[PDB]
Design a protein around this ligand. Structure first.
Ligand SMILES: CC(=O)N[C@H]1[C@H]([C@H](O)[C@H](O)CO)O[C@@](O[C@@H]2[C@@H](O)[C@H](n3cc(CO)nn3)O[C@H](CO)[C@@H]2O)(C(=O)O)C[C@@H]1O
Length: 182
């Protein structure tokens, strides 16, 4: 399962921007000058995308198992050459009963609207790359994303993000900080 988790979060992802998605049923189809991708609506995403053509979407694609789940957002209304938000990321690791660390960095946000799919996947890749995630059993460790209004979103690192959450989106301007406890 840990193996499975690392295989999943090590997969490539594709960050598509400002294109059309065509909803037929519970599937949104995207076409690139490179790939056709079919994206499943499994959650509250089902309630916002219109049947037929939807313009000016972005989508965060991870091939499952060219099928991906969720990760669809409104594209940015304006070009933001500067970032949308700077977010303190705070990782805490206990390399034993004797030693604890905190890494404290800046996570830039470039999207007005971002999916949980994107946060979950990117943070986990980060954590794999720089903090040995999934070299050990994850147990109880969680990412937590906290907003300015105190609302929060939890990602449990012992399982994949729940498919019904992949299409949930938040306002990237209102993310306050991100905290992880390995
Ligand atoms: C609503 C809000 O502002 N935050 C709220 C979040 C948030 O609604 C969801 O993350 C959106 O996807 O949910 C919290 O709880 C989740 C559970 O919602 C989620 N869940 C439950 C089930 C089955 O009943 N399937 N998924 O499970 C996770 C942990 O894996 C969380 O508990 C959250 O993310 O923290 C509560 C939070 O206040």
């Amino acid at each position: 399962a840990t193996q499975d988790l690392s295989e999943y979060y090590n997969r490539p992802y594709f960050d598509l921007r400002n294109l059309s998605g065509y909803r037929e049923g519970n599937t949104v189809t995207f076409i690139n000058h490179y790939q056709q991708t079919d994206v499943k609506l499994e959650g509250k995403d089902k309630d916002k995308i219109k049947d037929g053509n939807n313009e000016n979407l972005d989508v965060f694609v991870v091939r499952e198992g060219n099928n991906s789940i969720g990760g669809i957002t409104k594209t940015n209304r304006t070009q933001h050459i500067d970032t949308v938000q700077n977010v303190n990321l705070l990782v805490s690791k206990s390399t034993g009963q004797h030693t604890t660390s905190v890494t404290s960095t800046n996570y830039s946000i470039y999207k007005e609207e971002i999916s949980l799919k994107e946060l979950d996947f990117k943070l986990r890749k980060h954590l794999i790359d720089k903090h040995d995630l999934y070299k050990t059993e994850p147990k109880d460790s969680k990412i937590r994303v906290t907003m300015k209004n105190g609302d929060f979103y939890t990602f449990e690192l012992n399982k994949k993000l729940q498919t019904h959450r992949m299409g949930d989106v938040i306002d990237g301007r209102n993310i306050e900080k991100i905290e992880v406890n390995l």
